[PDB]
Assembly symmetry: D2
Homo-oligomer: 118 residues x 4
């Protein structure tokens, strides 16, 4: 159910596969920031979630370097899948750049993404 | 210099291998009962100008014994030198129902040291 | 633009007055559910269609309840017909040190005038 | 306890007064970023915290406008005061800049400061 192709509000594309032991792998395509083309993502998810109507906790990372570009940045997404009519992944993310120690205070962006398969 | 074992101040320990393909893999020890698979990515080609190396990993807090129905992501950067550290901000997201989704997510920071 | 009554999607409601010198003052909503708010905004935003930087704080104490916590919202006002306040918030509950790593929740809210 | 002069790890100066009512008032001066001289802050704190040795939840905002400069941004600190031989305010902060709709994805920095007497 998590496996498949997803989109967010910004129009990025995130092609995950959810493996057996809570492994998340795929590519990420973002509509924004220092980034063109596909980046490798990997993460993890809760492979044994709750029956009680609770969602499925997951997260992934993307290092924004590929064969064409290196932003010297990395983003992590934290959130939960929710199945149903409109299945969706509500996330919060943290994007950190490689900064000198004098710029580390301003090294990290925070934001939230919502993914859907539409 | 990311490869190796790292300690935070909370008593948590992580062992990670920094692969040549920007891969970050290892275990997180929050007692095998407490070890969790870690997976992430890092800037395999950092600047040499005094910048740290951006990185992120994730841990889903399920293993063969427990499941907290949650996941933590770390996003931060490796800083070399004789006093090396990984400085991070994390997001802990819990499995909740929709009416509880506002209370799904803890934020924090950790520093990691080679010790 | 900001001054007035804002509603989020959780039904919850706040009324604020932005004073000329970036003050934000109002209440966050049932008497028992009303709390004092205070914040600050950029009283002189760019004129480039950037929104208006602002934030505020609610400590969750009133004469009826005390949750021993504070929420702060950091976001920006985006005016016009359909105005929105898009925020991010940190909720921190007083904790012992031992539990301080789990002291602070994060999320986001979007408040509208309707 | 909370009332006083505070500094963070950045060499920033946080000068705050806590009201009986739960109001925070004061001035912040940051060592870093698009800032010089003092800025107005306002906040709230729990004016009747727990008895369990829990910290005092609190928060404040600085919109970064003063007569010297304007960064079109606001930082919200959220945290707790911790009494003791080493009084300390541990916080997480959100710095949101006014951005266009297009750049809103990168409007908000997150970070953490701890303030010492
Ligand atoms: O460093 C860069 O400029 C590249 C960052 C990638 C864009 C971010 S990651 C969080 C958010 N979600 C997206 O789909 N895009 C942005
Ligand atoms: O937008 C700007 O450049 C002004 C922001 C002020 C710098 C920040 S606020 C969070 C952090 N704590 C400090 O003492 N300084 C920085």
């Amino acid at each position: 159910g998590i496996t498949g192709t997803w989109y967010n509000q910004l129009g990025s594309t995130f092609i995950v596969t959810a493996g057996a032991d809570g492994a998340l792998t795929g590519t990420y395509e973002s509509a924004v920031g220092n980034a063109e083309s596909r980046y490798v993502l990997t993460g993890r998810y809760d492979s044994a979630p709750a029956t009680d109507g609770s969602g499925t906790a997951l997260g992934w990372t993307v290092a924004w370097k590929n064969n064409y570009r290196n932003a010297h940045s990395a983003t992590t997404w934290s959130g939960q899948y929710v199945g149903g009519a409109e299945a969706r992944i509500n996330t919060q993310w943290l994007l950190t750049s490689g900064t000198t120690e004098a710029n580390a205070w301003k090294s990290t962006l925070v934001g939230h993404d919502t993914f859907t398969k539409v």
